[PDB]
Amino acid sequence: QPWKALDAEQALYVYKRCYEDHLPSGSDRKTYMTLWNAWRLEPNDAITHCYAKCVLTGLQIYDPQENAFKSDRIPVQYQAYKTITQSKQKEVTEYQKALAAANAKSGSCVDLYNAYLPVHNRFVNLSRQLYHGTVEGAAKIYAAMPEIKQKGESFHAYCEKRAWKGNKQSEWKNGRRYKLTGSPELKDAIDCIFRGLRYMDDTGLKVDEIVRDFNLINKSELEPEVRSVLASCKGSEAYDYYVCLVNSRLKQHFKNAFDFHELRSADYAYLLRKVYENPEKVKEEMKKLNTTVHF
Numbered sequence: 001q002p003w004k005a006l007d008a009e010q011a012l013y014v015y016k017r018c019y020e021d022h023l024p025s026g027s028d029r030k031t032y033m034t035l036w037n038a039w040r041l042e043p044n045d046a047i048t049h050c051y052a053k054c055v056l057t058g059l060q061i062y063d064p065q066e067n068a069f070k071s072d073r074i075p076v077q078y079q080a081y082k083t084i085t086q087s088k089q090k091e092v093t094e095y096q097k098a099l100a101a102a103n104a105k106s107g108s109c110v111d112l113y114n115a116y117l118p119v120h121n122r123f124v125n126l127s128r129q130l131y132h133g134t135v136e137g138a139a140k141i142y143a144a145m146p147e148i149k150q151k152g153e154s155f156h157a158y159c160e161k162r163a164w165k166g167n168k169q170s171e172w173k174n175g176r177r178y179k180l181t182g183s184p185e186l187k188d189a190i191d192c193i194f195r196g197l198r199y200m201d202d203t204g205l206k207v208d209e210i211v212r213d214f215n216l217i218n219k220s221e222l223e224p225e226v227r228s229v230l231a232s233c234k235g236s237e238a239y240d241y242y243v244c245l246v247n248s249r250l251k252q253h254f255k256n257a258f259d260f261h262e263l264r265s266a267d268y269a270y271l272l273r274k275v276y277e278n279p280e281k282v283k284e285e286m287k288k289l290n291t292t293v294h295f
């Protein structure tokens, strides 16, 4: 419309969310992590199959609505960062062409894994350059693009810096709080944060993503209330939903969920090996990073 290439933060988000949703828990976690960290699509089982589908979908190599491998997106991804990656146009074309040969069949995890596997095995190194899948390569993207949220920087802090960039002091100068001012700066910060946390995107509200954050603080029983508060919220701007949550009977639980996601948004690896403890632990962890926490 046309398709927009993914930056280093967008790619890192895809990888970490797919780890969160597909890694097993307990003793088997490390086995899969070691292989996937090495960009090995192994072992050949349904855990890996659906992990692969997750990443292909998130990187938008596979489109679930068309049930199609989107070959022409590969050169777009390449072109957007070619002066940084130095990937070769010849290889990019070959990767594109290999994807054009791929048969998605039913679109199931295994069908996508089976189709993509030889393409992956042939073009793994190139794919890691194009889709910001190396530490060194991603670092070059961040260095060239200071307007991308960095590792170690929370979305709340990144967004604060862009919302209050004039003469007016940040409302969060002594630390972020939940004071509702309705200021244009606060509304901007909250839109930026809601988009960064994937609460909202170009298609609007994701009720399930806000619910996920309550589940992550062990408040699964609040799901119907979370849904009700969002549903009854008049207004469709990020700030409107934020006000609805903050002024509801969910207030403290929302603060805890949102603060935990602040931490997680600063450290995309947080959950990959660590679970929610309590609000005090979250605050201590945030002090180590570039966040909006009170010192």
Ligand SMILES: CCCCC[C@H](O)/C=C/[C@@H]1[C@@H](C/C=C\CCCC(=O)O)[C@H]2CO[C@@H]1C2
Pocket: 012, 015, 016, 019, 035, 036, 037, 038, 039, 040, 041, 051, 052, 053, 055, 056, 120, 132, 133, 134, 135, 138, 139, 151
């Ligand atoms: C279709 C799936 C192909 C395989 C993808 C692969 O398993 C990607 C793994 C990611 C890897 C990507 C590597 C480097 C990205 C930059 C990391 C950084 O800036 O510290 C590691 C981070 O997130 C997981 C962990």
